[PDB]
């Protein structure tokens, strides 16, 4: 029943150093990804190209704001960039998350179309265009991340002469409903960013595997190899996104559910202190992708 409140040491400059490294690597790799996608022949731009471009754009937008968070963490959680940049950086973080998961969902749906229902794939390509899908996913990401832009603010919480960039549910709720608003926003973000998109992803992958089981005894070898390459890079991207954003969402949801389950003091403190590392791991995904392209996609190696 001691109920400590402080965190474990300060992690030194490890989190800011990782943020800066991800900033450099993500900028370079995502610029190279966009250049490779938009430099090749436009007639040879597959449907995966637009989703890869949107993924790179989201990663670039997030890694642009990453140095601000590195500085924030370096100075013992002090925000010197004002309320506007707090709002913009947090909004870009959530926009990156939503856009990345939506683009991976689109890639998985495209693989399901081209692997399970080639005729329906052609029909949907005739109906659904890549530009429309990209615009819809980006607009949806912006709308879903707007609450963070609205509610985030900067305040000298706790009287430590350190302005902190925190979500302020004071405007949209009283004290008695601050927890309700926080839990609702967090659960909705976790759902629409990691549960529904990954449910769609897993359904698509299950049907792809079911069709490939039969395809192991039939189908053209060359087309099978091309599908293998594209499906491999897309599955690697999906799995990397899962491993990177699963600690963040899991710890967030556990913390939210702790209020309902009345979790012990020690577990709440442990989640509190482990959350920054989950946040760093989630940020690393914005730079991990170009290396995955390099090691798997033959097109990127050629360029």
């Amino acid at each position: 029943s001691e109920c400590e409140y402080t965190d474990w040491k300060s992690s030194g400059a490890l989190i800011p150093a990782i943020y800066m490294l991800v900033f450099l690597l993500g900028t370079t790799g995502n610029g190279l990804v966009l250049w490779t996608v938009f430099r090749s022949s436009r007639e040879k731009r597959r449907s995966a190209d637009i989703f890869i471009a949107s993924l790179a754009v989201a990663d670039l937008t997030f890694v642009v704001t990453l140095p601000l968070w590195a500085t924030y963490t370096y100075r013992d959680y002090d925000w010197p960039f004002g309320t506007f940049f707090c709002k913009l950086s947090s909004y870009l973080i959530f926009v990156n998350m939503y856009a990345s998961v939506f683009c991976l969902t689109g890639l998985s749906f495209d693989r399901y179309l081209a692997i399970v229902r080639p005729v329906a794939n052609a029909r949907l390509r005739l109906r659904v265009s890549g530009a429309v899908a990209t615009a819809v996913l980006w607009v949806l990401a912006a709308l879903l991340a707007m609450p963070v832009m609205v509610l985030r603010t900067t305040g000298d919480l706790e009287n430590t002469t350190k302005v902190q960039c925190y979500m302020d549910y004071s405007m949209v709720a009283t004290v008695s409903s601050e927890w309700a608003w926080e839990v609702g926003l967090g659960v909705s973000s976790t759902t629409v960013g990691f549960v529904v998109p990954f449910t769609i992803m897993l359904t698509c992958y299950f049907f792809i595997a079911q069709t490939i089981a039969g395809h192991f005894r039939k189908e053209r070898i060359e087309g099978l190899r091309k599908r293998r390459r594209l499906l491999s890079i897309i599955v690697v991207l999906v799995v990397t996104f899962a491993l990177c954003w699963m600690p963040y969402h899991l710890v967030k949801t556990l913390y939210m559910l702790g209020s309902l389950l009345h979790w012990p003091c020690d577990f709440d403190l442990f989640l509190m202190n482990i959350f920054p590392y989950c946040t760093c791991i989630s940020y690393v995904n914005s730079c991990l992708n170009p290396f995955l392209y390099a090691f798997f996609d033959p097109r990127f190696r050629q360029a």
Epitope: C3, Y5, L157, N159, T160, Q164, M167, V251, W263
Partner: nanobody, 129 residues
């Protein structure tokens, strides 16, 4: 629905030790942060001892060492041991609960919102000489 109830804080001459406590309701360690404030007649209310995520528990200059704040989550209680009083310690004390920021922010207690948070009824700690 967070509610607070005070206790103790009677009348003891200078250099004594007052055992003072505040109960709680609907407030958990993961949702609210507690603190003891004092308001003295003729001047403004001040902070005495705040349960503070950063820098640990925070104390006022006039209460360093002499006071001690503890919290029990199971019973949802907050304590204070006003040992070695001074003639200037006569004031009315309150227990205040503020919402705790989300895990994304860092779970810092929202003490700037201390006015909008739930405040205890208070007790007239009458420290004599």
């Amino acid at each position: 629905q967070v509610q607070l109830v005070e206790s103790g804080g009677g009348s003891v001459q200078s250099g004594g030790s007052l055992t003072l406590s505040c109960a709680a309701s609907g407030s958990t360690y993961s949702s609210h942060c507690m603190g003891w404030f004092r308001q003295a007649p003729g001047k403004e209310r001040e902070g005495v001892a705040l349960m503070t995520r950063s820098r640990g528990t925070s104390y006022a200059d006039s209460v360093k060492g002499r006071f001690t704040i503890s919290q029990d989550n199971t019973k949802n209680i907050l304590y204070l041991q006003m040992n070695s009083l001074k003639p200037e310690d006569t004031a009315m004390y309150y227990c205040a609960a503020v919402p705790r920021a989300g895990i994304e922010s860092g779970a810092y207690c929202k003490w700037n919102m201390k006015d909008s948070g739930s405040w205890g009824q208070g007790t007239q700690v009458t420290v004599s000489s």
